[PDB]
């Protein structure tokens, strides 16, 4: 039985070269033993029954053999020479009864064309030739960012127990512009083919929530492992693990209530980043919500963490409890600090931005763009300076200083006594 083998072949853009083998049982690839690749040494094996079609085309490292599977996966093998084409064509035809298709790619350098959703890959065609293709398995998320604009986020391979180290510059995000009244249908078709979320089976949804940061109205759909924010011009998927902290803070206007999420990695809207998501509720807004959970799943996983039904209570309380139950993060409420005016915080300006400073039991928190979180364990000293009916507070920490200006002088003594009580060094100079 003539086993045909190729040395120096790379699997899915692997950094390490391997030995590729064609057998009557299928395709095999094994990494070459000369590189200490922290990583399973196990041979990749593809059964002959799983092969649908095979294309030959120009890759980075020479020629690329792209294998389409019946399971809608694309396998990329790069590193072949141009001479190997005749041998590969004869062996693939003989062994699998599959034609090796030669696919020529557009080299014109044009950024316009037609997108074409093929079974396993998104294809961008320039002058009736493929310019590039993206496998649906590499797409992590997709989001409509405009009436004619579709943003696709790609899974940026970092460290997974099942993937070979990739070598080079990695594509993270692709934005397409689809003119005509058409981008929404393309987004729906991309969602169906890339097999993302199953419909919207959300444990709970909250409609029409006002965000101060990012600025907009968003629907919040909660799932067991993730939180979704749906907006008119942007969709975000946040994993429950990425939520670091939840703040529930009353605004000094005594008419609104702030719920603030710290997220790591910070959410990204084009170039700008949002490490804090600031939601604004009316205090008089009441909502009744039943959880979409089976009685067996509720008892086994969520008993004592979530209520089965929430009565007609304030929306921000229900939301804060749901976030606590699903993220397992503690909600940070206002601390024992009370201003001269019996308020839970003080009005101040950070640079050109007017806002509210909250002195919480473990941290100083400034709740207006930009949002500033300062733990007391990181504060070296607080300096009070005279600008005056007002005074300024400079907070020094290991990474710099923050000057909060325009604070009423009557609030000076309560703030100093509280900060001294928290063990922070106050200097009055």
């Amino acid at each position: 039985m003539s086993t045909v083998d190729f040395d120096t072949i790379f699997l899915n853009q692997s950094k390490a070269p391997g030995r590729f083998r064609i057998t009557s049982s299928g395709l095999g690839w094994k990494p070459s033993s000369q590189v200490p690749t922290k990583g399973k040494t196990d041979p990749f094996l593809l059964p002959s029954g799983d092969i649908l079609s095979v294309s030959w085309s120009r890759g980075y490292r020479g020629w690329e053999l792209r294998v389409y599977t019946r399971n809608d996966k694309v396998i990329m093998l790069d590193g072949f020479e141009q001479q190997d084409f005749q041998q590969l064509k004869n062996e693939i035809q003989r062994t699998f009864n599959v034609n090796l298709e030669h696919k020529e790619h557009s080299l014109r350098g044009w950024n316009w064309g037609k997108t074409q959703l093929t079974r396993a890959e998104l294809v961008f065609n320039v002058n009736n030739r493929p310019a590039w293709e993206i496998p649906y398995s590499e797409i992590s998320n997709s989001n409509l960012t405009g009436r004619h604009e579709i943003s696709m986020e790609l899974n940026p391979k970092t460290v997974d127990e099942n993937h070979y180290e990739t070598l080079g510059d990695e594509l993270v995000e692709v934005r397409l512009y689809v003119p005509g009244q058409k981008s929404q249908l393309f987004y729906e078709q991309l969602k169906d083919k890339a097999d993302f979320d199953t419909t919207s089976e959300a444990i709970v949804s909250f409609e029409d929530i006002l965000f101060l940061t990012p600025r907009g109205r968003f629907e919040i759909s909660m799932y067991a492992n993730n939180l979704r924010l749906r907006g008119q011009s942007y969709d975000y998927k946040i994993q429950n693990k990425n939520v670091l902290r939840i703040f529930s803070l009353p605004r000094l206007d005594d008419r609104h209530h702030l719920v603030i999420l710290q997220v790591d990695p910070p959410l990204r809207q084009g170039q700008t980043r949002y490490p804090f998501l600031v939601m604004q509720f009316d205090r008089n807004e009441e909502l009744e919500v039943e959880l979409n959970l089976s009685d067996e799943e509720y008892k086994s996983k969520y008993e004592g963490k979530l209520n089965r039904s929430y009565g007609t209570d304030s929306t921000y309380k229900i939301l804060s409890h749901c976030l606590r139950g699903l993220t397992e993060r503690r909600v940070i409420t206002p601390g024992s600090f009370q201003s001269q005016h019996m308020q839970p915080g003080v009005n101040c300006s950070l640079k050109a931005s007017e806002g509210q400073i909250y002195l919480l039991d473990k941290c100083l928190f400034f709740a207006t763009k930009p949002c500033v979180y300062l733990p007391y364990s990181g504060i070296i000293s607080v300096v009070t300076s005279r600008g005056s009916r007002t005074f300024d507070i400079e907070v020094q920490f290991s990474g710099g200083s923050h000057t909060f200006a325009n604070i009423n002088k009557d609030e000076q003594k309560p703030i100093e006594d509280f900060l001294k009580g928290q063990g922070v060094r106050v200097k009055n100079e």
């Binding site: 085309s57 120009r58 980075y60 350098g109 316009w112 590039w132 940026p156 934005r175």
Partner: protein, 144 residues
């Protein structure tokens, strides 16, 4: 439409483009981008502008391309793309790399290539006049 093309044949692609990274060809006025294991050319005339962001151990480059709606300062008489209501456009591509220094150099070289292209196009437009004329013919006798 000002017809431009990066390459006619795959043999024109620089052999240096093999380490799966962003590479620039000043001769073909082309940016070569690593999209899913393929060396995708983009001509400097399809490129609009870009940004660079540093994030932890990685450096991000966003490259923005010409698309209708998000248009450039060019007049209605000459588009950097062919007119087409049914044409879809690559508006932006974002890449990341662990090597910050090289990625900063690549961004500088893309920006320089764009400046040289715009300067050459301005120089061409300034010359498209009647400036091309016979060189001064010296008087054979004693000139005034």
């Amino acid at each position: 439409f000002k017809r431009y093309e990066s390459y006619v044949r795959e043999s024109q692609i620089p052999s240096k483009v093999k380490n799966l990274r962003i590479s620039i060809d000043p001769k073909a006025q082309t940016i070569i981008l690593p999209i899913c294991g393929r060396p995708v050319p983009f001509h400097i005339n399809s490129f609009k502008n870009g940004s660079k962001n540093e994030e932890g151990d990685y450096m991000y480059i966003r490259l923005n391309f010409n698309s209708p709606g998000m248009g450039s300062s060019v007049k209605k008489t000459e588009l950097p793309y062919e007119d087409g209501d049914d044409k879809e456009f690559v508006r932006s591509l974002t890449f990341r790399s662990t090597n910050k220094e090289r990625m900063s150099e690549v961004f500088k070289a893309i920006t320089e290539l764009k400046k040289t292209a715009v300067k050459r196009d301005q120089e061409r437009k300034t010359m498209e006049d009647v400036v091309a004329q016979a060189q001064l013919v010296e008087f054979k006798g004693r000139p005034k």
